[PDB]
Symmetry: C2
Subunit: 326 residues, 2 copies
């Protein structure tokens, strides 16, 4: 039932180059925090986000996804002409039409046999993209796929901070709104391939998904997310052999320190198997999972044989959990 | 005689149900042309570029408060009835529309929530201009062929109200330039509507139509040709035509190799339509018999990725499709991409 000939040939991430610290945000918000009499530092002390990155002026999602794609192709040591599928999984999109994938593909110079489209599914889309690509690889439709994701938050910061510091701003409009200030910029890309082409590479086994779409309608969400993850774990038991103590890394969506700590505590996971980047990068949406895996790889933390869980709880609510064997 | 492989076409995937929704408000080209007339005069335009050149006489609109997810959901409930199954049987729901309620969450999650899908139901959106329904069908077919689910919904609601209202305002400005006017005119060929399809493993619906899949080719060097956001679409229709037909020629070659296609052996061609002249050029350049090409563009316009399934649904409801018919699904989508797939009724 699991995928046996789907591999990860290459992976890369791009860290965005401008730093915006939560201290800096708080200096700009101080006058508003003071009217309103707010006195907790919600970003730094509660969410646990001390900084995030921002792109240069006028970097689009496509541009960031393109930069990641180029580095991933170098990591796989393959030319663009081998790519038969390019899936873009970002939340951020250049337009509604065409697909952001078509623009990234056009930038890269893919062949006329390359199928492209975008998948959107909040922070779980990269895992959905991987699974989609796996299915095509498995069937022999393509040899190599790129899954790419560039996330842009510059506009959301500009507009959100302009809003919040207006003289009319009510405190309701302030609170959920602060939430946008946990987002970050960044990009990732992965080349997947048929295993017989890349026999020493990590293998993607597949995964499971469960859903709680009765909540599409933000600490109920934390609680309801965990309940849904619990159900998703049960399915991961039955389809993948999962037990917590047998996994070497958990690569998880990163939303907040509290969200991460509650997850780790519910499941009795060793926190040392859970790398986090939100403290310096914030929440990079669906790119967070592959950015974390890529950091794990580049830091030499992944050994041959390691069992890696990729997962997230995404808006919807949805929860996906998949396995890679390094 | 000679053992041959499947060419990677889908095995044991069927279409269990299909439905469409027509949007309720007619907006005639005559009404649009009255609103545009002072601009036509200023720009020296003396031909009816909507009705006589593009060949669009009317389109349908929703109420302003209808979102893509609402339209899709309505189509989905109809498709479920067509398939005679309850929502609890659905293991995959994919939304394929260009229109979207939000960047996050997905439109599929909203539709799923409205329908009451089970907690086993996987959901996501796919975006790929006017070919996305077919992509969604392919993605679902891969799961169905492998036996991971029994039934899937593919859903698509399109809302063009905003683009109409804002385009018409921009185009009636005393200062709009000729170039802007021509860039935005194709927005006035869009229409509202919705479609949904329930796909199933063929063992469950033995008399249902079969979906085989098919072939795709691309020309993503042309990704700047058509660009759209929630209130504006700018299109180079001249190069979409020329470069579209070139890409399609290449994609017909692949279809001959993979699907066995010869145009004269297909019974129906369900085509995505940009305009009457684009459609006439495509049918002429490929030698397709015009009697095998159903058009709704005249009265409904270009419903984006919902066009193909809506036309398929209307053919089914007309009784034009009989058992054994070979049905080609074809489109050229912004990108550019071209997909060609086969249904056997």
């Amino acid at each position: 039932m699991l995928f046996q000939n789907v591999s990860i040939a290459g992976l890369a991430h791009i860290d965005a180059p401008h730093t915006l610290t939560s201290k800096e945000i708080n200096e700009r918000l101080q006058p508003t925090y003071d009217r309103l009499g707010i006195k907790t530092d919600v970003l730094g002390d509660v969410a646990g986000i001390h900084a995030r990155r921002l792109w240069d002026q006028d970097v689009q999602a496509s541009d960031a996804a393109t930069q990641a794609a180029r580095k991933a192709l170098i990591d796989a040591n393959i030319g663009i002409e081998k790519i038969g599928l390019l899936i873009n999984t970002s939340v951020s999109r250049d337009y509604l039409d065409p697909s952001t994938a078509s623009i990234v593909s056009g930038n890269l110079g893919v062949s006329d046999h390359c199928m492209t489209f975008d998948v959107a599914n909040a922070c779980l889309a990269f895992i959905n993209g991987m699974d989609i690509a796996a299915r095509m690889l498995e069937r022999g439709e393509i040899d190599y796929a790129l899954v790419v994701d560039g996330e842009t938050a510059n506009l959301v910061y500009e507009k959100t901070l302009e809003r919040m510091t207006s003289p009319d701003v009510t405190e309701e409009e302030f609170r959920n709104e602060l939430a946008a200030l946990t987002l970050g910029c960044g990009a990732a890309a992965m080349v997947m391939a048929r295993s017989e082409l890349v026999p020493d590479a990590p293998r993607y086994k597949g995964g499971v998904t469960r859903s709680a779409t009765e909540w599409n309608k933000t600490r109920l969400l934390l609680i309801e997310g965990i309940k849904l993850a619990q159900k998703t774990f049960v399915a991961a038991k039955q389809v993948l052999g999962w037990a917590v103590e047998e996994l070497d890394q958990f690569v998880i969506h990163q939303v907040s320190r509290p969200h991460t700590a509650a997850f780790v505590k519910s499941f009795g996971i060793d926190p040392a198997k859970v790398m986090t980047i939100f403290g310096e990068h914030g929440n990079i949406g669906p790119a967070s999972v592959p950015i974390v895996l890529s950091k794990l790889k580049e830091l030499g933390r992944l050994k041959k044989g390691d069992r890696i869980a990729l997962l997230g709880i995404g808006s919807g609510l949805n929860c996906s959990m998949a396995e890679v064997v390094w």
